[PDB]
Amino acid sequence: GTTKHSKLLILGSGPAGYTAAVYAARANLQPVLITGMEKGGQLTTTTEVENWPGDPNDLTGPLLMERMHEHATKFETEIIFDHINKVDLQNRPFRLNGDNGEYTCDALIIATGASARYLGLPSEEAFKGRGVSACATCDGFFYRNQKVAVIGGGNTAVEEALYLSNIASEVHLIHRRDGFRAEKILIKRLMDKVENGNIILHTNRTLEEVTGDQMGVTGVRLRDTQNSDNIESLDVAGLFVAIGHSPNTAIFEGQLELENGYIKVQSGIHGNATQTSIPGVFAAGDVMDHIYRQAITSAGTGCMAALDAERYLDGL
Amino acid sequence: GTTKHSKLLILGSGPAGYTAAVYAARANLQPVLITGMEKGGQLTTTTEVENWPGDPNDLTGPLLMERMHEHATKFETEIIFDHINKVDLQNRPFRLNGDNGEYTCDALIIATGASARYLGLPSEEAFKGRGVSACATCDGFFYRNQKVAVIGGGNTAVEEALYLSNIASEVHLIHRRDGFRAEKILIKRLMDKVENGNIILHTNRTLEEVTGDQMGVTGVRLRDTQNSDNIESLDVAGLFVAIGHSPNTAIFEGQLELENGYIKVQSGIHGNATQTSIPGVFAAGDVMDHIYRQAITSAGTGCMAALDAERYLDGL
Ligand SMILES: Cc1cc2nc3c(=O)[nH]c(=O)nc-3n(C[C@H](O)[C@H](O)[C@H](O)COP(=O)(O)OP(=O)(O)OC[C@H]3O[C@@H](n4cnc5c(N)ncnc54)[C@H](O)[C@@H]3O)c2cc1C
Ligand SMILES: Cc1cc2nc3c(=O)[nH]c(=O)nc-3n(C[C@H](O)[C@H](O)[C@H](O)COP(=O)(O)OP(=O)(O)OC[C@H]3O[C@@H](n4cnc5c(N)ncnc54)[C@H](O)[C@@H]3O)c2cc1C
């Protein structure tokens, strides 16, 4: 059973992980990065990306990540194809257990992500990348002035609808319940846009199927009500599934301070912003950000973690 | 005298400004961006950039910014060539005074930057981009295993030397004073690396000239001591000028909360992180970051500001 030790170990091969790698590599820290199951993170599950600063045209999640990876390898970053299933961050050096073996480190950067949960329907699965999306901020502008649907029943859903109501010509919010479980402000604003605006509520409804053509989503089928099989079809260009995300932090339960599954970082404006509750352990990307959730913000925090780790490893 | 009004106004055409523009543009906020004197920010004053995530090869500050600008224009961002010389953020809408006219806005994003101050020497000026640099994190790896010099006498200088001492084969810290005015920890660590390490102190010295060849810096000339013209030449591959930066915040004095010239933002992990002391005014990039100072971090905060402004303008 192998036990490998590196000064700096990075977890995750998405934007956050790779950027942390290039900054640590160009800092001469000889970083080791564990890719995780999904090599490339969430971006590999997407098509066109037109909000990455500097790439106005022809970019895709896969292409961006391929470039990220190449950049990381150019600086001799040691890429290990594994996935951590257990850790002990209460002892030095830190110990992480994977499938290919165990790893130890003096400084750790967690960039494991927080992927979105979907409905699990076959039709929905068929339209992913071609109409079905999980991030309004990412694909919303594609549906500028077109009818759009958002399905969910909490803050995440209402937030998506609110953000889409200034971009789409219409926003159809769908939920199985009669009401939405979101914070009072969002509910008031949502109702303002409903009472006299861009939003059309579809409560007590279940998404039976996502329909469309060779180009993308063209409709969505809803049913249910109350003791009646009342069905209604909606013409829609896009479906934003907003039922929630799953921060990859199970392995960290009882080890780090978490907030709704997210790793809590020091944040602030005085340095050591990616620091977790444990001196020497840092977090970047989605796993520690539930507000912006962008590749650029993820790469920014990835950069910060590498620099924080550097200063930490240098006793500063 | 013209008074133009836009829902959202962005100040600065560096990474932070442009990224904020693409995120606001793709948010359908129809942003107006005032470029400032230096169109493109600090990156235009540089050559090779190999720490921008996704661009392992052939990138330059100018090329990155040209791409940033094109991305911003692709989404119909209104670019105005001006520079703000006065503002009033205590009234709504906000009022900013330029040279081409006055501007008003419902939400403002400040991404004015914080450029580095140099020594002002003719030789130094001659070697900028070819040996003389102002950011270790940016150009340090270029001098991996080579002799390097850093000139300054405070935290910024010592920090640069410390960061370079794990990358360069030698680090020559130069200052006109006998000691360094930095925080105790940095001084202890600096002395550890001096007593038994990578750093060679050159106190009570003045940089008389930066010398080099068609490829770059090859040396640096020092003089002074104490009542004696004692001169000493040093073979060095790079000179990092670390005497300080100048946050472009004069116009904001008495208007916003500042910290050593930097605009204080709310920060945190619960959203509205780029918010300044004034509801509706946001800051991104160098002007609000004196720790990382990277294009990627600047673009990240630029992204956040646009999203914070969006949520603000939407009454959330
Ligand atoms: C539909 C959709 C489209 C998108 N397109 C865009 C877009 O246009 N623009 C944009 O800015 N963003 C886009 N995103 C990406 C998104 O913004 C993410 O927030 C971003 O990828 C997060 O980066 P990350 O590095 O933090 O995490 P992730 O990309 O999620 O990567 C996490 C990495 O860590 C690994 N990992 C997980 N658990 C472990 C473990 N235990 N051990 C080791 N490794 C582990 C994973 O395998 C993976 O490599 C899109 C997202 C969605 C939902
Ligand atoms: C020697 C050197 C080399 C560099 N190369 C790299 C590199 O390889 N990698 C990297 O990550 N970073 C590099 N940088 C850039 C640096 O990291 C900066 O921190 C980055 O450019 C900051 O982005 P910004 O958008 O906040 O500000 P800036 O780029 O400084 O831009 C500020 C903008 O706002 C404008 N402005 C200022 N005042 C006003 C006003 N009153 N009204 C209107 N507009 C105004 C300016 O004209 C300018 O357009 C380098 C820096 C230096 C010192």
DSSP secondary structure string for all residues of A202-221: EES-EEEEEEEETTEEEEEE
A88 strand-pairing partners: A95
What's the rounded Cα separation, in Å, for the pair B24 and B41?
A: 19
Measure A224 CA to nearest chain B CA, in Å.
32
Distance A243 CA to ligand 1 centre (A): 17
Pairing of strands B147-151, B170-175: parallel
To the query of whether residue B139 is one of the catalytic residues in this protein, the response is yes
Which residues in A lie closer than 8 A to residue B262 (C-beta atoms)? 269
Q: Element (H or E) spanning B34, and its range?
A: strand B32-34
DSSP B264: P
C-alpha of B311 from chain center: 27
Q: Quick one: tokens of B147? A: 């002799």
Check A144 against B28: CB less than 8 A apart. yes
Q: Which of B105, B106, B135, B192 is catalytic?
A: B135
DSSP B250: G
DSSP A127: H
Q: For the stretch B218-249, what's the b/e string if a residue is b when 16 or more beta carbons lie within 10 angstroms of its beta carbon?
A: ebbbbbeeeeeeeeeebebbbbbbbbbbebbb
DSSP A117: P
Distance A185 CA to ligand 2 centre (A): 37
Q: Which CATH number fits domain B1-116+245-315: 3.50.50.60, 3.40.640.10, 3.20.20.60, 3.40.50.670?
A: 3.50.50.60
Q: Quick one: tokens of A237? A: 């260009």
Q: Does residue B232 come out as left (phi exceeding 0), alpha (psi in the -120 to 50 range) or beta?
A: beta
Where would I find the beta strands (DSSP E) of A58-196? Answer: 78-80, 86-88, 94-97, 102-110, 114-116, 132-133, 147-151, 170-175
Nearest CA to ligand 2 atom 3: B46
Distance A149 CA to ligand 1 centre (A): 23
User: CA angle, B14 as apex, B288 and A303 as ends, to 5°?
Assistant: 60
Measure A265 CA to nearest chain B CA, in Å.
8
Check B28 against A271: CB less than 8 A apart. no
Q: Quick one: tokens of B15? A: 């990474």
Q: Residue B249: phi, psi to the nearest 5?
A: -135, 15
What angle in degrees, to the nearest 10, is found between the helix axes of A61-74 and A15-25? 20
Sign of CA dihedral A8, A12, A15, A16: negative
To the query of whether residue B135 is one of the catalytic residues in this protein, the response is yes
Range(s) of chain A covered by CATH 3.50.50.60: 1-116+245-315, 117-244
Q: Which of B120, B124, B112, B170 is nearest to B145 (CA)?
A: B170
Check B53 against A71: CB less than 8 A apart. yes
The residue assigned the tokens 């600047």 is B298
DSSP A234: E
Q: Quick one: tokens of A150? A: 């958002």
- Cα–Cα distances in Å, from B44 out to A164, B104, B247? 36, 29, 17
Where would I find the beta strands (DSSP E) of A73-225? Answer: 78-80, 86-88, 94-97, 102-110, 114-116, 132-133, 147-151, 170-175, 199-203, 206-213, 216-223
Closest-lying ligand to the alpha carbon of B113? 2
Please tell me whether residue A61 adopts helix, strand or coil conformation: helix
The residue assigned the tokens 């909000």 is A51
> Out of B52, B166, B304, whose CB is closest to A314?
B166
Q: Quick one: tokens of B77? A: 């961002």
- Cα–Cα distances in Å, from B23 out to A268, B72, B116? 23, 9, 28
Q: Which of A172, A45, A217, A212 is nearest to A116 (CA)?
A: A45
Measure B177 CA to nearest chain A CA, in Å.
23
Position A191, amino acid: M
Position A117, amino acid: R
Query: Are A217 and A238 contacting, i.e. CB atoms less than 8 angstroms apart?
Result: yes
Pairing of strands B86-88, B94-97: antiparallel
Question: Which residues, including other chains, have CB under 8 Å from residue B21's CB and lie 6 or more apart?
Answer: B10, B31, B33, B72, B75, B77, B302, B306
> Which value in Å is the resolution of this experimental model?
2.5
Q: Which of B133, B122, B119 is nearest to B46 (CA)?
A: B133
C-alpha of A218 from chain center: 26
What angle in degrees, to the nearest 10, is found between the helix axes of B184-195 and B155-164? 40
Query: Are B19 and B303 contacting, i.e. CB atoms less than 8 angstroms apart?
Result: yes
Q: Quick one: tokens of B279? A: 């509801």
Q: Residue A183: phi, psi to the nearest 5?
A: -70, 130
Q: Which of A282, A288, A289, A270 is nearest to A310 (CA)?
A: A282
CATH, range B117-244: 3.50.50.60
Query: Are B35 and B85 contacting, i.e. CB atoms less than 8 angstroms apart?
Result: no
- Enumerate the active-site residues of A: 135, 138-139
B247 strand-pairing partners: B114
Q: Does residue B103 sit at the A interface (CB-CB below 8 Å)?
A: no
What's the rounded Cα separation, in Å, for the pair B4 and B98?
A: 11
Q: Quick one: tokens of A294? A: 């962008």
Q: Residue B296: phi, psi to the nearest 5?
A: -65, -40
Position B227, amino acid: N
Ligand 2 contacts (CB < 6 A) are B 11-17, 34-39, 41-43, 46, 49, 51, 61, 83-84, 111-113, 115-116, 133-135, 138, 248, 251, 285-286, 293-296, 298
DSSP B52: S
Q: What is the tally of helices (H) and strands (E) in chain B?
A: 7, 19
Determined by X-ray
Query: Are B137 and B294 contacting, i.e. CB atoms less than 8 angstroms apart?
Result: yes
Report which ligand 1 atom has the smallest distance to the Cα of A293. 19
DSSP B251: G
Question: Which residues, including other chains, have CB under 8 Å from residue A299's CB and lie 6 or more apart?
Answer: A15, A16, A18, A19, B53, B296, B299, B300
- Cα–Cα distances in Å, from A155 out to A12, A182, A291? 27, 4, 11
A6 CB under 6 A from ligand 1?
no
User: CA angle, B64 as apex, B61 and B66 as ends, to 5°?
Assistant: 105
DSSP A45: G
Sign of CA dihedral A165, A167, A171, A174: negative
Q: Which of B192, B115, B131, B130 is nearest to B161 (CA)?
A: B192
Query: Are B80 and B34 contacting, i.e. CB atoms less than 8 angstroms apart?
Result: yes
Check A140 against B71: CB less than 8 A apart. no
A133 CB under 6 A from ligand 1?
yes
What's the rounded Cα separation, in Å, for the pair A264 and A245?
A: 16
Position A132, amino acid: V
What angle in degrees, to the nearest 10, is found between the helix axes of B15-25 and B295-313? 40
What's the rounded Cα separation, in Å, for the pair A82 and B174?
A: 46
The residue assigned the tokens 């001006």 is B82
Which residues in A lie closer than 8 A to residue B258 (C-beta atoms)? none
The residue assigned the tokens 């500063």 is A316
B221 strand-pairing partners: B209, B233
C-alpha of B48 from chain center: 16
The residue assigned the tokens 């479906």 is A239
Q: Residue A68: phi, psi to the nearest 5?
A: -60, -50
Question: Which residues, including other chains, have CB under 8 Å from residue A305's CB and lie 6 or more apart?
Answer: A16, A20, A109, A111, A274, A282, A283, A284
Burial (CB count <10 Å: 0-12, 13-18, 19+), residue B150: buried
The total number of residues shown for chain A amounts to 316
A69 CB under 6 A from ligand 1?
no
Q: Which of B7, B83, B11 is nearest to B282 (CA)?
A: B11
Burial (CB count <10 Å: 0-12, 13-18, 19+), residue A45: middle
Residues 188-217 of A with CB under 8 A from B: 189
What angle in degrees, to the nearest 10, is found between the helix axes of A155-164 and A184-195? 40
Sign of CA dihedral B46, B49, B54, B57: positive
Query: Are B145 and B137 contacting, i.e. CB atoms less than 8 angstroms apart?
Result: no
For chains A and B, what is the number of CB pairs under 8 angstroms?
175
